[PDB]
Amino acid sequence: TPQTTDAPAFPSNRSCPYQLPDGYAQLRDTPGPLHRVTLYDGRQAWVVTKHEAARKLLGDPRLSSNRTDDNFPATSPAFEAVRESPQAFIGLDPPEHGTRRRMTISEFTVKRIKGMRPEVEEVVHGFLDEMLAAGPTADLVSQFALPVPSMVICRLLGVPYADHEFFQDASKRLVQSTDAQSALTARNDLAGYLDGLITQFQTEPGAGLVGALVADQLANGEIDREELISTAMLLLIAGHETTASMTSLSVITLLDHPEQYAALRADRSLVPGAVEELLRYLAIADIAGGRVATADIEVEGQLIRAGEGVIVVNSIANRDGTVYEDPDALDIHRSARHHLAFGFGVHQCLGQNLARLELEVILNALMDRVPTLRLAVPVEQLVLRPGTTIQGVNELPVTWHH
């Protein structure tokens, strides 16, 4: 009759945009690096819930990133579209992972990201121009948080922004669908589009990273055509959805901590540190922590057995009080160094410094151009995405001094 379990259902949903779900707070407080959970289909898996243990297991080659493994810890039926072959390098292990990742790294270097700053500022202020010209109220998501990173990543990739309604919609359907059929359709829509773009570039060599992969690696048989599609799709979707969620959740969080938001406005040298703290605190991508053991792993007396699924839950690890004193306190002045919002090791987020640039430019622009920005509804009225996808809000009504 008692319902207590030692393998609670995973994932949990946030009720507050920037707070751990109650069940995650429970996992955070329970000693030990690992904890059993039950996934949507009844299967048991391990979650990693402490900070150094998370780094250790992210660096352990025995925890494979191969999503096509039958034992990979899928958290929803929609996962079967990500289990579609071929995998982009996020789903590959060394040595294949490295050969594919190095086809893309040149677009994400510190020198390239620095070169992008004028363009990102132009895009950010252009969409602010438009949203502010029309006056309040507005949905910050559709009008600003999503189009800005979309326009930026399209230029990076060589994908025509003219088609943005098409791939923004497909991107949403892929990331947010709860059934395999809906996800597979969205994936097929994007794949067919990207396959046509490849053919166009074979006719007329094109700009951007897709153009470069077509002209070089594909022409040399060094990447499969369908790998190129998967790779472009990874970057296109991650380029859209991640940054947009950080923007909306950071605005919500900062407006709920007005003393720190005011301190940030008063001293813009605090923005880089504030971005690190917001990344640590909001940790929007637990959905990207899944691994499968290819061999037994001993972890501080607990045994992960070959064939078991393991989810490195970076949001919980980022609230490890042995690393971040008073971990559930937002503190833009703390050292948020070593946070795991981008992962750790060979798969650490390729876009991390583009994301850091965009959030810095965005926060500075909002504080510059809309210092009176405020939510047009109460926080409790917003609808948070579930834990089976990237954290965030699908709409964010805002107003300001016209």
Ligand X SMILES: Clc1ccc(CO[C@H](Cn2ccnc2)c2ccc(Cl)cc2Cl)c(Cl)c1
Binding site for ligand HEM (CB under 6 A): 65, 89-90, 101, 234-235, 238-239, 242-243, 246, 284-285, 288, 314, 341-343, 347, 349-351, 354-355
User: Among 27, 63, 194, 238, which residue interacts with ligand X (rule: CB under 6 A)?
Assistant: 238
Any contact of residue 223 with ligand X (CB under 6 A)?
A: no
Shortest distance, position 324 Cβ to ligand X, whole Å: 22
Q: Map tokens 């409790």 to a residue.
A: 380
Residue number of the CB atom closest to ligand X? 238
Which regions of 49-205 does DSSP assign to beta strands (E)?
63-64, 138-139
Beta bridge partners of 312: 48
User: Among 37, 74, 197, 234, which residue interacts with ligand X (rule: CB under 6 A)?
Assistant: 234
CA torsion through residues 362, 367, 368, 372, sign: positive
* Maximum distance among all Cα pairs of the chain, rounded to whole angstroms: 68
**Residue 233 touches which member of ligand HEM, ligand X, none, C-beta under 5-8 Å by kind:** ligand X
Stretch 318-357 residues interacting with ligand X (CB under 6 A)? 349
Output DSSP code: residue 386: P
Any contact of residue 237 with ligand X (CB under 6 A)?
A: yes
Using CA atoms, how far residue 282 sits from 17, 206, 277, 315, 319, in Å, is: 8, 37, 8, 7, 10
HEC string for 237-283: HHHHHHHHHHHHHHHHHHHCCHHHHHHHHHCHHHHHHHHHHHHHHHC
Shortest distance, position 402 Cβ to ligand HEM, whole Å: 31
**Residue 101 touches which member of ligand X, ligand HEM, none, C-beta under 5-8 Å by kind:** ligand HEM
Shortest distance, position 133 Cβ to ligand X, whole Å: 30
Site string for ligand X, 90-119 (x = CB under 6 A): x-----------------------------
Rounded Cα distance, 284 and 383, in Å: 15
Beta bridge partners of 45: 37
Residue number of the CB atom closest to ligand HEM? 351
Any contact of residue 235 with ligand X (CB under 6 A)?
A: no
Rounded Cα distance, 317 and 51, in Å: 4
In the numeric block, which tokens belong to residue 384?
A: 């948070």
Question: Residue 72 burial by CB count (10 A; 0-12/13-18/19+): exposed, middle or buried?
Answer: buried
Task: CB nearer to ligand HEM: give 177 or 391.
Answer: 391
Task: CB nearer to ligand X: give 246 or 254.
Answer: 246
**Residue 194 touches which member of ligand X, ligand HEM, none, C-beta under 5-8 Å by kind:** none
Any contact of residue 243 with ligand X (CB under 6 A)?
A: no
**Residue 138 touches which member of ligand X, ligand HEM, none, C-beta under 5-8 Å by kind:** none
Using CA atoms, how far residue 300 sits from 37, 248, 297, in Å, is: 18, 38, 10
Nearest to 389 by CA among 241, 240, 186: 241
> Per the annotation, where are the binding residues for heme?
97, 101, 291, 347, 349
> Per the annotation, where are the binding residues for calciol?
75, 187, 230, 287
**Which residues of this protein are in contact with ligand X, per CB under 6 A?**
81-82, 84, 90, 174-175, 187, 233-234, 237-238, 241-242, 285, 287-288, 349, 389-390
